[PDB]
Curated annotation (Swiss-Prot):
Species the sequence originates in: Coxsackievirus A16 (strain G-10)
Protein residues bound to Zn(2+) 1: 50, 52, 110, 112
Protein name: Protease 2A
Function text: Cysteine protease that cleaves viral polyprotein and specific host proteins. It is responsible for the autocatalytic cleavage between the P1 and P2 regions, which is the first cleavage occurring in the polyprotein. Also cleaves the host translation initiation factor EIF4G1, in order to shut down the capped cellular mRNA translation. Inhibits the host nucleus-cytoplasm protein and RNA trafficking by cleaving host members of the nuclear pores. Counteracts stress granule formation probably by antagonizing its assembly or promoting its dissassembly.
Range covered out of full length: 869 to 1008 of 2193
Catalytic activities: Selective cleavage of Tyr-|-Gly bond in the picornavirus polyprotein
Subunit structure: Homodimer.
Amino acid sequence: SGAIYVGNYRVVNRHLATHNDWANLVWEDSSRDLLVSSTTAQGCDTIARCDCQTGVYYCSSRRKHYPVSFSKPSLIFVEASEYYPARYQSHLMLAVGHSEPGDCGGILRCQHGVVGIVSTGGNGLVGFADVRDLLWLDEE
Ligand SMILES: Cn1cc2cccc(NC(=O)Cc3cocn3)c2n1
Ligand SMILES: [Zn+2]
């Protein structure tokens, strides 16, 4: 589990969104595994605006933050889980790292701020849904 809290937005994995998220919806995209809902309180996270390929992510199944090298956001075939049919997921970055399901939501960050959130992985893979192209998260 986990979310990004930027401005009056809450960014979560679409597959983990609550009824309150869907009732206060700003934007969602199944192909990216992302959903954004509105918040009453202002958040403290800042979004990175860059092309970094190194950063650190939080792994809840280890209680640890790990430094990683990750690929640029791409269209990747991901295997069937309980949440999606084997399909192509867009705007996804991969790194080598310990992952399990309930880790989705952990933040990946670089020197500029939050890069994305955990979404896919297994066999020492961890896939992050990028948010750096969502420039509108910084306004309104
Ligand atoms: C971090 N992590 C490890 C996983 C192992 C297996 C499945 C994962 N992801 C999901 O269930 C969510 C999903 C995205 O696209 C399709 N399904 C994993 N995430
Ligand atoms: Zn960066």
